[PDB]
Design a binder for this molecule. Structure first.
Ligand SMILES: Nc1ncnc2c1ncn2[C@@H]1O[C@H](COP(=O)(O)OP(=O)(O)OP(O)(O)=S)[C@@H](O)[C@H]1O
Ligand SMILES: [Mg+2]
Ligand SMILES: [Zn+2]
Lengths: 526, 408, 97, 166, 53
């Protein structure tokens, strides 16, 4: 069962990088380093590479027939008794095929002269370099630049020539002309824009040392809390909540098939001068697979999804979907209307978006943690009212948020001095106990942990939930309003996140007490 | 095409050594426009901008020109567009020349999915002078929110997901609602622009043309000079002097400037401290105007003097675009305190009213009957149902669909 | 000839979905209604067509799946770990139970 | 109905109530759908047949569905002191279709809260991913976990339901 | 009373062009007090037309 191996020499790190504008026909058959933004990629079709034909009579095998841009086939039979000038049957099993993809790259935005439309190119990807250039990503292709003729004029077994300066006179042409098109042939493309043991084995020993120092530390939790968003002064509670958001819970799935949420949702409500958008921007710039979006609903597709007719229906990905398995930093959560809030009620608890519009019906996946940032109604927060009054959100959506953080710009003469000294100090140059790249590996390591509840942890959790519901009882009929069983699941999620912060596989009642404190501080706002 | 120099460096040194360089540049920005001294100053500082600090910090100046409709609101726009190296003049309402936002087009020829960049992108470093900023669509208003906040435009359409670096400068000029701007009314009630969008601008000059014969005589005489004209100023040297200052000069702020700034911010805030005057966004913007003023004059160090120069500009701007008892919150929120008291009174009046009634419930018309008639003056109707929303949030009363509404 | 398209659940968010044509031969016709989500087992064959070669300009072939079995997974996406082409089909012992 | 892009004529394609024919159709957040979208299931929920007469296509599809819809009372909380009609925005023609209307109340009982919290915590512990070859050992573990809560196995319950139905 | 009047630089430009047109009808360089009086009379009459009755 010998399998002939076809090799593909890849050349990279060329001294100079050209561009779509700098294409000249005098560089044909030479190595380039074209860079552009991919806008369209075709399917991975198999192209004929080394054909092997078998003639229809005398069964002689003509093999290793090199293929041009056409469907070139052998003209003569090696056996001097077979009459065959146009009749063969290709042996698909014996022939060798190669992956073939055609990407449509264009000029970069900064390289486009004002007014002029961007110049496009068609780059052919073959072999292992297929599907390595997704649309939108700016890639730096490198390979030979060739010119692709019009194979219709060359004559094909199944089609006919179809109707700027075309040469003619070839024997295979006759009276029709031949036109040529420049097309790059990439040989290498790069973009320029998990158990614990598996993760550890993929990490260099020097990084292993730094991680070992973190895990064995005594005050690791407080150091992490202080190292989250260093450019933001104060707000230790919000920093702790953001830190717990990245770790998350455990996405458990029960035996009946019901999925239990493991993601933690935060809502940073605060006065308009506060630092909410700074938190959101830090999270979107640090956490992987995270997006930043506002409630203003910029794109036609909403926060969740939409269907657009093609001149059939197709699904447009919303913000809540592009951040799948990540964090969806939603800004201006109050601005988005109540008729828009009803869309994310499922996406925030069941973590799926169900669409049945017209000929299209899918249950799309949104396994995202939302970090909202809503301004209070009336611009400035009013402490005389409960958190419900200051926010336009309703009970069904207010109960899906694990943590509510209220941040206020109190008119304190002293506090403004530290604020100004801090902001001006940054613009002049913050010392974090853990740098961003250093903290990222710790978070990745901690996420591999899946903490479990000890026997006493369960009793403590039940008692704390009972206390929460007792203190939240309202009305003559004893009807809880703010605290549902979602709050018990929130305590479980926060306990798991805290235990992941300490890098411990068992959840102790201390963690549950801390989670209970975190929830209690968000509802005692009266 | 019918359509950098050592001597140039010497010319830059000659103009920079001039004591009146700042006023000279202000005059050269809009030579054909009279008065508007501070507006030209702010535009000049916008042309330079703050240091592009990296480690994201904007380091740029965003200026909105409000007031009653002004021909200069357009003339000075074309002037600054000609002055700035990069950037493009664009109309927010029309957007005919450029779409003002990056969106995917089918170019028809080959019918391919070409991505064409908007007006915001392609103007990095330059100034994207917007016009008719008030009449622009909500969809592009969200794009403006994104570009001024996130500094990038992100697209997810037709299988293309990408983020485009904008890094642009916004110089918008929006006409007001009605015949002309009303100075008595706040800027939000006159410009028809969301408060979050208005608060994003570092300096917002309220260019007004109020009637008075003393000023009108001089203005019309200067205009007649223009009529009679057609039948020292670096007119063109500045468009490259700005680039030279933007490249060669990298201003760095010092400790004396730090102390002066912190003091300035604390002072602004205390001017009024119950109310809320300035905000940390304004503090960071001042960090930007001082850097721009140091970038201009080619000193690459933010000395003390630039700090109070920028503080004076910011204070004058705030005194202009805020109400007479300068609030600094009406720009950030339509609901002003003198307005917020109205809702807070109506909600409790509604609570007490419904209580004494049960002492039961009614739809909206009956509630209007006992509120606008004798409870107070002829107040607006929608404010009552707006306070009903706050009451619902507090769970004090319940609204039974379109009709009656009672209390739990 | 049914035309499979990548399910919106498994499509990477924001990306265009790929699709391959599937040939259903005898006894397999009318077993997959349009819009339903199915799992198709079959031979992944390729045939040469001149139209595709002319369009792409390369000796590229067109692939197609000759279906050998079809199991529908629409409305039971939480039923992984089960065996057989029909989760709801019962054997004689199951009926006796 | 849609204009077929290849043959260029109007063709009829089914929706949720046709894809769920002789099955169940599940409508979460029933009260939040548009009224002019919620009224479209009046015929298919009582007559069990969708009648379409658009674009020259006069036909009556068959939809033998069984709607199970989850609603949410006005204001987010079910007010026990008011009748049912005053707690929902739905009207009589759509309320009469539902054979069983289950009203769920979230009350505060310390015994009930204790029992519910104990059950939820036990379920969260049970479902933990960290809780004679691999296949049948895994199957044995799954059956061991199932037998705690479900008297009849789910993989057999599905077949039982299908057998009883057909 | 109606705010559709506040004389604006554009009214001056219109007055200038109306006077230019009037002289353009009457020989050359006829723009004097005689022309501008008629131009301003026409402008004022047009403004008053908005306030008819
Ligand atoms: N504690 C803080 N530490 C550092 N910078 C702060 C802090 N509080 C406010 N700021 C600065 O204040 C400015 C405005 O804060 P943002 O994060 O933009 O909040 P915001 O988005 O303006 O709030 P709204 O309601 O959307 S206007 C930014 O330049 C922040 O860096
Ligand atoms: Mg913000
Ligand atoms: Zn032969």
């Amino acid at each position: 069962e010998q399998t002939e191996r076809v090799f593909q020499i890849s050349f990279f790190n060329l001294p100079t990088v050209h561009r779509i504008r700098d294409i000249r026909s005098e560089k044909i058959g030479s190595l380039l380093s074209i860079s552009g933004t991919v806008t369209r990629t075709s399917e991975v079709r198999p192209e004929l590479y080394k054909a092997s034909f078998t003639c229809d009579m005398c069964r002689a095998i003509v093999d290793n027939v090199e293929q041009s841009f056409k469907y070139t086939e052998p003209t003569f039979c090696p056996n001097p008794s077979c009459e065959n000038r146009a009749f063969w049957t290709l042996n698909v099993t014996r022939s060798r095929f190669l992956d073939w993809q055609k990407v449509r790259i264009q000029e970069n935005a900064n390289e486009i002269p004002t007014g002029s439309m961007p110049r496009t190119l068609d780059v052919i990807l073959r072999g292992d370099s297929v599907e390595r250039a997704k649309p939108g990503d700016r890639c730096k292709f490198t390979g030979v630049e060739i010119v692709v003729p019009d194979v219709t004029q060359l004559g094909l077994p199944g089609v006919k020539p179809s109707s700027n300066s075309g040469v003619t006179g070839l024997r295979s042409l006759g009276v029709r002309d031949l036109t040529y098109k420049i097309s790059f042939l990439a040989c290498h493309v790069i973009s320029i824009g998990r158990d614990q043991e598996v993760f550890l084995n993929s990490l260099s020993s020097d990084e292993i040392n730094e991680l070992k120092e973190m895990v064995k530390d005594e005050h690791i939790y407080d150091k992490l809390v202080r190292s989250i968003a260093p450019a933001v002064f104060g707000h230790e509670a919000v920093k702790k909540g953001i830190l717990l958001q990245m770790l998350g819970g455990v996405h458990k799935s029960t035996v009946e098939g019901i999925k239990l949420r493991g993601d933690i949702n935060i809502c940073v409500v605060g006065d308009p001068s506060t630092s909410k958008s700074q938190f959101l921007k830090y999270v979107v710039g640090f956490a992987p697979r995270s997006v930043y979006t506002s409630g203003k609903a910029s794109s036609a597709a909403g926060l969740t999804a939409a269907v657009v007719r093609d001149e059939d229906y197709t699904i447009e990905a919303g913000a809540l979907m592009l951040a799948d398995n990540g964090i969806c930093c939603i800004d201006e959560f109050d601005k988005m209307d109540i008729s828009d809030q009803v869309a994310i009620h499922e996406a925030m608890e069941q973590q799926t978006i169900s669409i049945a519009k017209a000929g299209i019906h899918a249950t799309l996946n949104a396994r995202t943690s939302i970090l909202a940032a809503a301004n209070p109604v009336g611009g400035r927060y009013n402490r005389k009212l409960s958190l419900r009054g200051n926010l336009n959100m309703t009970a069904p959506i207010m109960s899906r948020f694990d943590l509510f953080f209220v941040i206020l710009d109190d008119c304190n003469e002293k506090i403004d001095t530290e604020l100004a000294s801090h902001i001006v100090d940054l613009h002049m140059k913050i010392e974090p106990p853990f740098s961003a790249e250093q903290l990222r590996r710790y978070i990745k390591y901690a996420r591999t942990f899946k903490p479990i509840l000890t026997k006493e942890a369960r009793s403590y959790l039940v008692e704390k939930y009972k206390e929460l519901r007792k203190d939240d009882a309202q009305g003559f009929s004893r009807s809880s309003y703010r605290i549902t069983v979602r709050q018990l699941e929130s305590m479980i999620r926060l306990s798991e996140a805290i235990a992941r912060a300490n890098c411990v596989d068992e959840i102790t009642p201390s963690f549950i007490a801390e989670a209970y404190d975190l929830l209690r501080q968000s509802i005692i706002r009266v | 095409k019918v359509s950098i120099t050592d001597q140039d460096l010497a010319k830059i040194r000659e103009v920079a050594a001039r004591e009146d360089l700042y006023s000279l540049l202000a005059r050269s920005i809009a030579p054909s426009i009279y008065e508007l001294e501070d507006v030209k100053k702010g535009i000049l500082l916008q042309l330079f901008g703050g240091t592009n600090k990296t480690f994201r910090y904007r380091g740029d100046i965003n200026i909105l020109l409000c007031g009653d409709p002004s021909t200069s609101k357009s003339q000075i726009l074309q002037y600054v567009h000609k002055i700035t190296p990069r950037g493009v003049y664009t109309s927010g309402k029309g957007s005919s020349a450029v779409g003002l936002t990056a969106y995917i087009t089918r170019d028809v020829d080959t019918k391919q999915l070409v991505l064409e960049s908007g007006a915001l992108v392609l103007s990095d470093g330059g100034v994207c002078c917007i016009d008719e900023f008030d009449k622009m669509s909500d969809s592009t208003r969200s794009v403006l929110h994104e570009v001024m906040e996130q500094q990038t435009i992100s697209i997810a359409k037709a299988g293309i997901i990408t983020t485009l670096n904008a890094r642009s400068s916004i110089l918008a000029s929006a006409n007001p609602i009605g015949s002309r701007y009303n100075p008595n009314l706040p800027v939000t009630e006159n410009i028809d622009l969301p408060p979050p969008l208005l608060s994003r601008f570092d300096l917002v000059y309220l260019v007004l043309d109020k009637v008075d014969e003393k000023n009108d005589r001089e203005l019309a005489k200067h205009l007649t000079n223009l009529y009679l004209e057609d039948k020292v100023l670096p007119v063109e040297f500045l468009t490259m002097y700005i680039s030279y200052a933007k490249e060669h000069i990298h201003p760095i702020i010092t400790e004396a400037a730090k102390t002066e700034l912190v003091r300035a911010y604390v002072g602004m805030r205390k001017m009024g401290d119950k109310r809320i005057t300035a905000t940390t966004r304004q503090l960071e913007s001042m960090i930007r105007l001082a850097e721009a003023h140091a970038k201009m004059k080619l000193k690459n160090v933010v000395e003390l003097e630039d700090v109070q120069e920028a503080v004076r500009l910011i204070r004058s701007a705030i005194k202009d675009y805020a109400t007479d008892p300068k609030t600094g919150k009406i720009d950030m929120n339509l609901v002003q305190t003198g307005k917020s008291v109205i809702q807070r009174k109506l909600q409790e009046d509604l609570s007490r009213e419904i209580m004494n009634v049960l002492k039961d419930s009614m739809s909206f018309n009956e509630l209007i009957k006992q509120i606008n008639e004798h409870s107070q003056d002829r107040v607006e109707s929608s404010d009552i149902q707006e306070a009903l929303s706050r009451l619902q949030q507090e769970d004090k009363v319940i609204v039974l669909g379109e009709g009656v509404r009672r209390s739990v | 000839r049914v035309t499979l398209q990548e399910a919106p659940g498994t499509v990477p968010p924001g990306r265009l979905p790929r699709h391959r044509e599937v040939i259903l031969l005898a006894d397999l016709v009318d077993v997959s209604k349009p819009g339903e989500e199915v799992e198709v087992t079959g031979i992944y064959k390729n045939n040469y067509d001149g139209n595709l070669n002319a369009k792409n300009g390369f000796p590229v072939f067109a692939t197609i799946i000759e279906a050998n079995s079809i199991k529908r997974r629409e409305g039971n996406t939480a039923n992984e770990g089960e065996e057989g082409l029909d989760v709801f089909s019962w054997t004689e012992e199951e009926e006796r139970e | 109905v849609r204009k077929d892009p290849i043959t260029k004529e109007w063709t009829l394609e089914g929706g949720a109530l046709v894809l769920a024919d002789k099955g169940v159709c599940l409508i979460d957040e029933f009260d939040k759908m548009n009224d002019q979208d919620r009224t479209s299931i009046h015929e298919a929920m009582e007559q069990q047949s969708i009648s379409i007469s658009k674009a020259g296509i006069v036909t009556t599809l068959q939809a033998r569905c069984s709607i199970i819809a989850a609603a949410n009372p006005n204001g987010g909380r079910y007010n026990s002191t008011l009748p049912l009609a005053q707690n929902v925005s739905l009207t009589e023609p759509i309320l009469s279709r539902f054979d069983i209307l289950c009203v769920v109340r979230d009350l505060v009982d310390e015994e009930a809260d204790e029992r519910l919290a104990t059950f939820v915590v036990d379920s969260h512990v049970r479902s933990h991913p960290e809780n004679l070859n691999a296949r049948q050992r895994r199957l044995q573990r799954q059956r061991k976990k199932e037998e705690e809560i479900s008297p009849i196995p789910q993989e057999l319950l599905m077949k039982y339901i299908h057998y009883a139905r057909t | 009373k109606f705010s559709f009047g506040q004389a604006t630089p554009r009214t001056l430009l219109g007055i200038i062009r109306l006077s230019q047109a009037l002289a353009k009808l009457r020989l050359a360089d006829m723009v004097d007090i005689d022309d501008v009086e008629e131009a301003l009379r026409l402008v004022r009459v047009s403004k008053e037309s908005l306030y008819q009755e």
